[PDB]
Write a protein that binds this DNA or RNA. Structure first.
Lengths: 65, 46, 93, 73, 113
RNA sequence: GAGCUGGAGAUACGCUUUGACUCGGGGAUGUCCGAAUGGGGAAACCCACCUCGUAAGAGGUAUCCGCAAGGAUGGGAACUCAGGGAACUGAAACAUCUCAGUACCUGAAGGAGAAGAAAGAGAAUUCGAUUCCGUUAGUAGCGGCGAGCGAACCCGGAUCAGCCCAAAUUCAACCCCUCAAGCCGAAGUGGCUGGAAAGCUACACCUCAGAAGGUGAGAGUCCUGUAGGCGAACGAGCGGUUGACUGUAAGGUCGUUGUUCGUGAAACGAUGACUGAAUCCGCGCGGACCACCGCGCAAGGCUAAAUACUCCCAGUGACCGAU
RNA sequence: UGCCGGCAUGAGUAACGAUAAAAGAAGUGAGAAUCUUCUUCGCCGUAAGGACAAGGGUUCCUGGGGAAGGGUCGUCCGCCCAGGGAAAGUCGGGACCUAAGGUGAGGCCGAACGGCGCAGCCGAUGGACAGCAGGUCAAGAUUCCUGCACCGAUCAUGUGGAGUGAUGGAGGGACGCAUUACGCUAUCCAAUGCCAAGCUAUGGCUAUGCUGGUUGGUACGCUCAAGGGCGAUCGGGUCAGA
RNA sequence: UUCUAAACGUUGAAACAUGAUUGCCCGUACCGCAAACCGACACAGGUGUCCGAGUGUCAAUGCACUAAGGCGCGCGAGAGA
């Protein structure tokens, strides 16, 4: 997040996936994850690079034409 | 002993199994004789 | 990438009962082989993996009285791990 | 499909249904027949637009020696 | 499903959050309707109208008690709405100031909130 | 619009009032099969080989026509033909026949193709472009001369409009104009047996808009329609003046299918082998031919409109009632 | 003498299934005859064993409850409920070859559909391992522990000091029937061969009377080749295995 | 393991010894000539493959019984005209 890459092409976000999506799969597990905690902070930030790879093949298509 | 059929359906693949009615063009309409012809699903994928 | 295969544990009782020396069991993707599932679990977390396994295990969900209800297939990847990476505490017992 | 003659062909009609010795005179005839047939021509040729192999016809070479498409064999 | 709702009343009743009203339709006629959130698309509403009695059990959970207050029943709107006073004159009229989200001015004898 | 994403309405988890929640149109991730077609080829599944490259792995492989790319072929519920072809029945059985060119097969495109401007119908010495039904004619004929099929002569409208082989169409501004999200839309209540009764009663207001319906007892004053009218970004859709184009180069014999004509007392579509004559006051026929008239001329097609069709979107009917 | 839906009666009889014996202690609890810990019985054991073949796909388990089913029923199911269980470089597909046959653009022809076929892919059980025995829980095994075979394999140094790329003809893998033995152990059997846990009032013996238990491939030897087939440096195919 | 042409080839391409390295997904659990796979059902039906202890008996897989292993089968008793 956010919609900040509406103006930034330079492969920095290239490893942005390595951020929270690295051990939130280690919170996506069964038990000791979040039942009464803040359960929602999983696939509520898993569209973290999804629906954001749009205008990424319809904007980032900027190669040379 | 031998029944009247028994398993193993090779002659219901590349002959009479889903995509095997092109080898026999006038079988395509036969394949299409219960899909694009009348109601009902089909009979090769239940 | 370097991480986009790695995905979840396996949690068993005869895991760290039978899975203590170092071996785990993973939870990969339908994509078998092995030329991805490894370097995924190789980064800033100080843990290294090699000797991967990969198996199978289906699903089976015959629930309603009739028969309407079923499968999920899914897999897993056991691995091995020799002397070199013990624990130093993390998230598993 | 490289079966029927390239020209115009004959099949797809033609039947029979004739009689047997009786053509309005003494006794009204029965009938006796009522079946199918068809007709086809022959060979020999050279070239016309779209080469493949050759089938041609019969009554399609006699005066069929003008409307060419590029040949001189 | 337990057919109650009253979703056959058709969703266009305007109501929102924060309001003071009375009631009718019977059973009570002594109950200042108020507060609440409402439920567009199938609506539940009870207010302090009907004093239910619906004892919950007492496992080993946290509930052990019973209750006898606050619980579902039925009967949507259609009682006594609008009018700071009490009766007469509708209200669905709206200032040429857009903001449909909470347009405020009603009929002749209407209120702007 | 501001709140919560379809039936085990899913508790919870989470997001609000300058865009969470549902979405109108022009796009996109699009798995095995479908034309899908790398190969295997028994839908969910195994192989080579080149571009990439921190040792891993990323870009793709099939036939036809202007041929050197490409463009196309897929599956279709009723509309025309064409290759298409029997048949139980009837004649009180019963090979010509009625069913008919019908069942089925296969080829085509638009949702329109099919006949449709001609070597023509008629007949008083008239009339032009196909088809449908209206009326005739249910006549003439046909015909184991049997049941039976069945035009033209006079009629309606949709239509009573031009040109094609050798001396118009394509992007767009404007548009009467359609397509879903959607905007408002009318006008008073009390008492009983009782579930608030719209039943008994009482009075006004709303009127071009007073069809179905939900909220415990049929409600115009609770509300969605109806009359009054609106809506952009994308595009079609029936378009109106115009910009980038140039709107005027074969009869015949013998054997037979059809036509209403089972074919014989009859020209006329055309084929099986034989005749490519006429060639212009020459040529096609009036149901064979004689004589005279009538009209049309080798030579290739376009023609939208109605006739006949019924996948979808509102609305509409003296039907059923969830074997 | 219809059709379905329900109630019927044949009626509580015939029948519980191949007539191939079972009693009980005890666990449990709702009572227990058919469960469970178990001494006694007997039927098969070229079987009604275990693995591979087709199949069912949820069988097997950690176990759990009768509504119903297993034609008694039951505290047993593989009924029904969440999870658990078949860990690969060599046992398994393909790619390297193939008989029926199918298919194959061009093509041989057919009224279309198509039939078939040249260059081809398939289509099989089929030609193709270079490890055996132990350590394994609730279920899985030659993938899990140990002494162990490596076919060609990923790079580089050291006798090679120089060879090699196609469909191949090869030798050959390409085996018909039957007989005879000229070979053979595991496995089996001679047990007092090795070591014994130890012996019964039964009557009887303690000793040449006695339960039981003890090798495997990688490897290679005039103590493994029992047995079947003669090997090499010069000249040419008086013209083809394109 | 039977043989190489264009080309490739002189100091390196491959056959050699060796450390290092490989055979991809799927089965590898259940009954299995088996009330669970086909007979309208868990009806006394059903066909392939590998081992196949035993004394006795010309051989004998016919024939008795214990292994290992499968097991009383979808019942129970009486009186048993």
């Amino acid at each position: 997040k956010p919609s900040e890459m509406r103006n930034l092409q330079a492969t920095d976000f290239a490893k942005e996936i390595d951020a929270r999506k690295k051990e939130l799969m280690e919170l996506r597990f069964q038990a000791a994850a979040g039942q009464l905690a803040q359960p929602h902070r999983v696939r509520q930030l898993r569209r973290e690079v999804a629906q954001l790879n749009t205008v990424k093949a319809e904007l980032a298509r900027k190669g040379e034409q | 002993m031998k029944r009247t059929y028994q398993p193993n359906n090779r002659k219901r693949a590349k002959t009479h199994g889903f995509r095997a009615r092109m080898k026999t063009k006038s079988g395509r309409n036969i394949l299409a004789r219960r899909r694009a012809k009348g109601r009902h699903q089909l009979t090769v994928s239940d | 990438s370097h991480y986009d295969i790695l995905q979840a544990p396996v949690i068993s009782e005869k895991a760290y009962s039978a899975m203590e020396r170092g071996v785990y069991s993973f939870w990969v993707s339908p994509k078998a082989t092995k030329t991805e599932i490894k370097d995924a679990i190789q980064q800033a977390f100080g843990v290294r993996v090699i000797g991967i396994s990969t198996m199978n295990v289906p699903g089976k969900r015959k629930r309603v009285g009739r028969f309407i209800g079923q499968r999920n297939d899914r897999k897993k990847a056991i691995v091995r791990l020799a002397e070199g990476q013990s624990i130093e505490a993390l998230a598993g017992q | 499909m490289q079966k029927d003659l390239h020209p115009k062909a004959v099949p797809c009609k033609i039947i029979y249904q004739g009689q047997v010795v009786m053509e309005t005179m003494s006794t009204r005839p029965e009938i006796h027949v009522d079946v199918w047939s068809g007709v086809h021509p022959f060979w020999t040729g050279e070239e016309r637009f779209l080469d493949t192999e050759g089938r041609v016809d019969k009554f399609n070479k006699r005066f069929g020696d003008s409307y060419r498409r590029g040949s001189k064999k | 499903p337990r057919p109650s709702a009253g979703s056959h009343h058709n969703d266009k009743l305007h109501f929102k959050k924060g309001d003071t009203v009375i009631v009718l339709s019977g059973k009570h006629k002594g109950q200042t309707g108020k507060v609440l959130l409402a439920l567009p698309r199938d609506q539940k509403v009870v207010v302090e109208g009907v004093n239910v009695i619906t004892k919950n059990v007492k496992p080993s959970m946290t509930n052990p008690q019973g209750g006898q207050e606050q619980r579902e029943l039925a009967l949507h709107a259609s009682k006594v709405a609008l009018v700071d006073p009490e009766t007469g004159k509708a209200t669905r009229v709206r200032k040429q100031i857009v903001d449909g989200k909470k347009v405020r001015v009603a009929v002749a004898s209407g209120k702007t909130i």
